[PDB]
Structure 1
Amino acid sequence: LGGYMLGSAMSRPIIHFGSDYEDRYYRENMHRYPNQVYYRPMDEYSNQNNFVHDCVNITIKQHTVTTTTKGENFTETDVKMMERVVEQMCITQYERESQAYYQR
């Protein structure tokens, strides 16, 4: 996992899991969860959600791998929480640079 750059940061979004505890558990700890995503400048092929799929996957996985070796045992919930958040971040990132392709 090289040959990629990291965009600006965006405000760690509070996707609701349907239970205030999951919301707050994340929230107080939201400093731990990622606030940026791996992307490219406009890429070469642009997509609604398939971009998000891989943009998320790589960013999610880059937590999941490292965290294991930084002595932080992350379970399905420490990933699935993050997943919704990284999905947002990749949506936001796509929409944030692709918007300005129509303003050049």
Structure 2
Amino acid sequence: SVVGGLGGYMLGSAMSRPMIHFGNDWEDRYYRENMYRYPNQVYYRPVSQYSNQKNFVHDCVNITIKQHTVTTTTKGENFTETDVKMMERVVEQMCVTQYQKESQAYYDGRRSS
């Protein structure tokens, strides 16, 4: 499997580093000690096809995940559960964010006011 997933997606290009403290001690330290492995980018489709967050953030998360979980696992890149369960939010953050910005890109108010 190589990048056979993104249905014609794009990359918003290197953005905010999300970081997540979980309110834990151990999940917090774990995350901070490892957060560089998770990409600083996510693959998304033009919001215009949708107009929602879920329909933009859904398999966007899965696709990018599965890229850094399979397309990179080729170099032995082995994210455990205690990794996936963290990056499940990491990829969500930048997409939630890229979505909000893109939300005025596709719209520009330009269809209402």
Please say whether Structure 1 and Structure 2 have the same fold, judged by a TM-score greater than 0.5: yes
Q: CA deviation at 1:80?
A: 1.1
Task: Find the counterpart in structure 2 of residue 41 from structure 1.
Answer: 46
1:67–1:74 contact (8 Å) kept in structure 2: no
Runs of 4+ deviating beyond 4 Å: none
Partners of 2:19 and 2:70 in 1: how far apart? 24
1:14–1:23 contact (8 Å) kept in structure 2: no
Work out which of the residue numbers 70, 88, 92 in structure 1 matches 2:93. 88
Partners of 1:8 and 1:103 in 2: how far apart? 24
Asked whether 1:102 is paired with 2:88, we answer no
The number of residues matched between the two structures is 104
Q: CA deviation at 1:56?
A: 0.6
Q: 1:77 to 1:69 in 2, by over 3 A?
A: same
Aligned-pair identity (%): 86
Gaps of 5+ in 1: none
Instruction: For residues 27-78 of structure 1, give each alpha carbon's deviation from its aligned partner in whole angstroms, at most 9, with x where no partner exists.
Output: 2332211111101233411212232111111111111112321112221121
Task: Find the counterpart in structure 2 of residue 76 from structure 1.
Answer: 81
CA RMSD of the aligned region, Å? 2.0
Task: Find the counterpart in structure 1 of residue 57 from structure 2.
Answer: 52
Gaps of 5+ in 2: none
2:47–2:56 contact (8 Å) kept in structure 1: no
Name the SS of the counterpart of 2:49 in structure 1: coil
2:43–2:60 contact (8 Å) kept in structure 1: yes
